Design a protein around this ligand. Structure first.
Ligand SMILES: CCOC(=O)c1cnn2c(=O)cc(-c3ccc(C(F)(F)F)cc3)[nH]c12
Length: 206
């Protein structure tokens, strides 16, 4: 694996952003986190992140046991919290086979599920490949609220302390055959002021 994606499904873009209200006058947007995928990746042993994701039911541990392991990834984000209009999230996946996807996103706090978002995306055949777009989806209110509180902290190390207990688990399944296609675990730190968002993608091995 050389990127976030498998033989059956590749992540092309993900971004979490805000467009200030004056973007209508002159467009701009702030990216909190961003992955653009328009030598193999480093690996991380899954035991090292087991605590950040509750055992619970159908958690990282359970899903990873069912497999296949080449479908499991860890993304480390350095979020850019240096920026009040539209808060949005955009995702795009690609595949060679025609499928209907169910994308489940679970937000955890202190290894306890807080909110869950589930959506179904159908394929658009474009240039011999199938594309799945969910663009400009409104960011869930819990995380818009979280970002506002998070930016109020006076110290970067306090934001990292808070973000230590904050994880997202994203599961993409083939809706018709129910087989898992992709599972990404996301962990978070805050980027320093001058640096924008950054990420590091790893394969989850055990
Ligand atoms: C990481 C993968 O996320 C998703 O797949 C997804 C789906 N709905 N969704 C939101 O409705 C808000 C965020 C988000 C909001 C804020 C931040 C952060 F800036 F705090 F890091 C990160 C993700 N993320 C998501």
């Amino acid at each position: 694996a050389r990127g976030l994606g498998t033989a059956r499904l590749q992540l092309v873009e993900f971004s979490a952003f805000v467009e200030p209200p004056d973007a209508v006058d002159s467009y701009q947007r702030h990216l909190f986190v961003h992955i653009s995928q328009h030598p193999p990746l480093e690996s991380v042993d899954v035991r090292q992140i087991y605590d950040k994701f509750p055992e619970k039911k159908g958690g990282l541990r359970e899903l990873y046991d069912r497999g296949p392991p080449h479908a499991f990834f860890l993304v480390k984000f350095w979020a850019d919290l240096n920026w009040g209009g539209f808060y949005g999230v955009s995702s795009q996946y690609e595949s060679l086979e025609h499928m209907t996807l169910t994308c489940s996103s679970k937000v955890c706090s202190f290894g306890k599920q807080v909110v869950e978002k589930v959506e179904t995306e159908r394929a658009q055949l474009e240039d011999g490949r199938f594309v799945y777009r969910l663009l400009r989806s409104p960011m869930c209110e819990y995380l818009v609220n979280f970002l506002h509180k998070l930016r109020q902290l006076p110290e970067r190390y306090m934001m990292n302390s808070v973000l230590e207990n904050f994880t997202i688990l994203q599961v993409v399944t083939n809706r018709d055959t129910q087989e898992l296609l992709l599972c990404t675990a996301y962990v978070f730190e805050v980027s320093t002021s001058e640096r924008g968002a950054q990420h590091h993608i790893y394969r989850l091995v055990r």
